[PDB]
Amino acid sequence: LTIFALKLNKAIRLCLTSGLSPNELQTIVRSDNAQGIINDSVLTKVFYTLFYSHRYALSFDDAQVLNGSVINQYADDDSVSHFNRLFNTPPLKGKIF
Amino acid sequence: LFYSHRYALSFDDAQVLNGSVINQYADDDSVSHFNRLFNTPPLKGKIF
Amino acid sequence: RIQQRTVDEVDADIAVLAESRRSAQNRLEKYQQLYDEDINHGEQRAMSL
Amino acid sequence: RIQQRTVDEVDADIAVLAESRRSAQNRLEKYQQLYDEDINHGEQRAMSL
Amino acid sequence: LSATASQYSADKISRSEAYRRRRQEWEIQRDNADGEVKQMDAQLESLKI
Amino acid sequence: YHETIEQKKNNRLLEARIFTRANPQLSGAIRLGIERDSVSRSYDEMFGARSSSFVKPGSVASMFSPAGYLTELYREAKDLHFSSSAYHLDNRRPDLADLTLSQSNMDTEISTLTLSNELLLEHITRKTGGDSDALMESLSTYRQAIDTPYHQPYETIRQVIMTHDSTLSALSRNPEVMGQAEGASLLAILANISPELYNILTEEITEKNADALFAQNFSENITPENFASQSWIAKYYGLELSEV
Amino acid sequence: YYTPMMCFQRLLQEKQFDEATQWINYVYNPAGYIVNGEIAPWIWNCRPLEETTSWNANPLDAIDPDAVAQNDPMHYKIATFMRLLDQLILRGDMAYRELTRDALNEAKMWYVRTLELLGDEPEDYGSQQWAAPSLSGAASQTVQAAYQQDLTMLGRGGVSKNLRTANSLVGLFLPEYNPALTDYWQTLRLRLFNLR
Amino acid sequence: ASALHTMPSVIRTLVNIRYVTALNKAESNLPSWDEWQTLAENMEAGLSTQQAQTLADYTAERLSSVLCNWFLANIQPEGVSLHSRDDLYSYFLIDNQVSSAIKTTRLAEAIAGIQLYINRALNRIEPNARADVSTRQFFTDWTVNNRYSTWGGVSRLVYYPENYIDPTQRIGQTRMMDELLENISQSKLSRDTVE
Amino acid sequence: SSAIKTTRLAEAIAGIQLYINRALNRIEPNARADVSTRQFFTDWTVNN
C-alpha cells in the first residue's frame, strides 16, 4: 500500500493547500497524461488555470480548456459532464456523437 | 497647548513638536507614545 | 408668477401642519387628563364594598 | 445664500429625526421594562389565594 | 364560606391589578402622543424656514 | 464532620458580623446607633488595621471579585487527581500554579490566540530544548504533518501581496519586467506552495526509494497498515468520508 | 417590626409618600420620638433592635438572608434605614417631573435632606497597599488554616496574645463596600451635578 | 516598485527567485532562512496599521493551527488518547482554534479552564478520577458554583444580606400576616383602609 | 450656575427650611430640644 499512499498524499496535500477539488485534480492530471502522475507540467497547468480563473472569472472547466488541455468528456459523471455542458443542453434532436 | 489648539493635535503630538523627545515611559498602564509610534503592533519580533 | 405660486404652496403646507399640531395636542391633553385622574370614586367604592 | 439655506433645511430635518428617535427610544425602554417585570406579586397572590 | 371569601378576595385584587395595567398602557400611549407632538412641532420650524 | 461544618459556619458568621460593624460606609447618622465591642477590639489588635481596610467593588482585592473566586476554585480543584497521573493540573498546566493576581493581570486585554500560542511554544521548546527561531526553521523543512512545512515569511509575503493587488493585474500592465518573472514565482505568490511543498510535490515515487520517501513523508508511527483505513485517512487529514 | 415594614413598603409601592413616612416613623425616626410631651432617650423605636438580640442559632443551614439577618439584628437595622432613604430619593423624582421652579427648590431640599442624613462616603484604601501573591501561595492550605484557627480562637476565646499576626502572610482578601450604597452615592452626586 | 509601494531592489530580488528548486530551469535562487526573513521584513515595512493588525491576526491563526498539528504528530503524553484539535482543547484546558477577533483577560481564561476541568472531572468522563475528593462540600453546590455570578450572589448574601433582603415577601411567614398582606394590596390605600 | 433665577423670599424660605431640618434630625449639636417639641414641629411633615 506504500506507493498508492504516496500518490494520494501528494494529491491531497496539493488540493488542500490549493483549494482544488478531487475531480479538478483528476481532470488536470488526466489531461497532462493518462499516467496520473505529477511533474512540473501538472503544476504548470494548475497555476495557469487558477490564474486565469482569478482574472477572467471563469470556472475550473474554462480555465482547464484554456491552458491547452481538452474539453473533458468524463467529469464526475454523477452530474452532467463538461462536454455535455457544451453540446448537450439539450441535444438538438437526437443523441450526440 | 497652542499647537493642540490650532493644528488639532493631542497633547503628546505637540509635546514632541515643541523640541522635546518622544516619551518612552508614559503612564505605563497603557501604551506609551513611543510604543504607539513603533509598537502597534511590533513588526514580527519585539522592538529594539 | 410661478414662484409666487410655489411660496403660496409652502404657506398652505404650513397651515396644514399647524392644524395637524392642533389635533395632536388635543389628543395629548385628552390622554393626559384621562391618565392623571387614574381611578375615580366609583371603582374605589367597588373595591371597598 | 439659497444653498446655505438648503443646508439649514437638512440640519433641521436631522434634528427632527433625532427627536423622533428619542421618542421611539423612550417607548422601547418603557416596553422593555413592562415586559421584563412580567407578573408582579399582586397577580401571584391572586393565584395563590 | 372560607373558600368563597377567598375567591372574592382573589378576584378583587386581580381586578385592581388589571386596572393598574390599563393605567400603564394609558401612560405609555400618552407619552408616545407627546413625542409625536414635539416631533411635529420641530417639523413646523423646518417647514417655515 | 458536623463539628467542623458548624465551626466553618460560625467562623463565617463572626467574620461577617465584625466586618459589618466597622464599615465606614455607615456614617451616616446611623453611626450613632452602632457600638464598639470587646471582640471588635480583639480582632483589631489581632489583625491590625485589616478590619478598617475595605475596597472599592470592581477591585482585585475583594473577596467577591473574580480573583478570590479563582483562588477558591484552584484551592478546591488542586486535588481532583493524584499527582502521579497525567491528569494532574500541575502536570498539564504547570504555569498555572504561579499565576500572579494583580490588577493589571485582570484588566489587560489580549487575544486567546496569543496565550494559546505561547503555551504551545513553551511545551514544544521544553521538549526539543531549542528556541522559537530554530522551531520555525525546522518547520520550514518539516514534512511529517498535514500543515508542514510552514514558511512563515513566505506566507506573509503571499498575504501582503494579496492585500495590495490580487492577480497582480497591475503587474501584468508591465510586460517588460515579465521578461524576468516566469510563471513559477507567480504561482508561488498566487497559490500556497512553499519551496519544500514544491519539493514534496515534484519528487518521483518509485519502489527503489519507496519506504525511504515514506519515512520522509510521514512520522515513524504512521505506516501503510495505518494508511489502509478510510476513517483513518479522514481523521488524518481532517476530511469527510464522502470527500475521500 | 414586620407589619409596620409591610404597610410602609406597600405604601411606597403605590407612589404614596407622606402617610408612608408617618407610618415608618412608628419603628424608626431620625428626628427621634416624642413620648409624654418630651424627647425620647432611645434612638430606634423598636426595643429588640436597641437591645441587639438574636433569635436564630444556625442561620446558614438554608440560603436565606432572613436567617442571616435574624441571627444578627443590626443588619435589619441598616436595612430599614436603607428603605427609608429610598423614599427620600423617590420624593425627588416626583418633585422633579414638573420642572417648576418652586418644585425644583423642593427637590433640592429633599436631596440635601438625604445628603445630610447619608453622611460622608468613604473611599478605596486597601487596593494600593495590598501586595500581589501568586495563585499557589494565595491558595496555600496553611495560610487558610491559620486564618480559620485565628478566627475560632477569637470566637470561643478572644485571647489577646499574638499581638502581631505577621502580616507577611499576605494571602487573604479584603471586604468590599456594599454596591447599593455606592449606587445611591453616585445617584445623588449625578443628580446634584445635574441640578446645579 | 510604486505599484507595491516599495523599493526596486526588493522587487528585483523577488523576481530574482527562480522558483525551480534545483533545476528544470536556470538554477535554484531560493533565499536562505535569514535572507527570507529579511526580504519579508523589508517587503512588509510599507504597511499601514489596520493592515498590520490583519496580518498579525492571519499569521497568529496560521501559526496556531500549525502548532496544534505539530504537537499532535510529535508529543504524545501518556495517559491521554489525544487525537484531534478538541482533544488538545480539553487536555490543555484552553481553546486552540478560535478566531482572533475574540479578546479576553488572563483571569477570565484561567476561570474558563478551571471550570472545564472541574466539569470534566465530575461527569466521570475522565479515567482514574479521585472520586474520594469529588464528594467535597464545594462540589455538592456545583450547580450554583459553576458560575462566577451565582457564586458571588451566594457569597455576598451572608456578609451583605441587605441587598437581597426583601421585606415584601419572606419564607417562614404566618398566613395571618399574609392575609394582612393581601388585604393591603388594593390599588389605593388611604388612611382608614390600612387602619 | 447663574441660570437659576429666584427672589429673596424664595431663597429665605429655602434657607430657613434647611435650618429647621438640620436642627430636627440632631445633626446639629447642642439643639434646644425643649423648643424642638413645639406644635408647629409636630406637623413638620405637612409644614415642610
Author numbering:
A (entry chain B): 441 to 537
B (entry chain C): 490 to 537
C (entry chain D), D (entry chain C): 2100 to 2148
E (entry chain D): 2198 to 2246
F (entry chain B): 50 to 293
G (entry chain B): 1807 to 2002
H (entry chain B): 880 to 1074
I (entry chain C): 978 to 1025
Paste lines from the article:
ABC toxin complexes (Tcs) are a class of α-pore forming toxins (αPFTs) that consist of three subunits capable of assembling into a single protein apparatus with the ability to shuttle and translocate toxic peptides into target cells. The two TcAs termed Xn-XptA1 and Xn-XptA2 are the targeting components of each complex and display variations in insect specificity. The TcAs are the largest subunits of the complex and contain a translocation channel with hydrophobic loops at the end allowing for membrane permeation. Upon TcA binding and an environmental pH change, the complex undergoes a conformational change into an active state in which the translocation channel is exposed and pierces the target cell membrane.
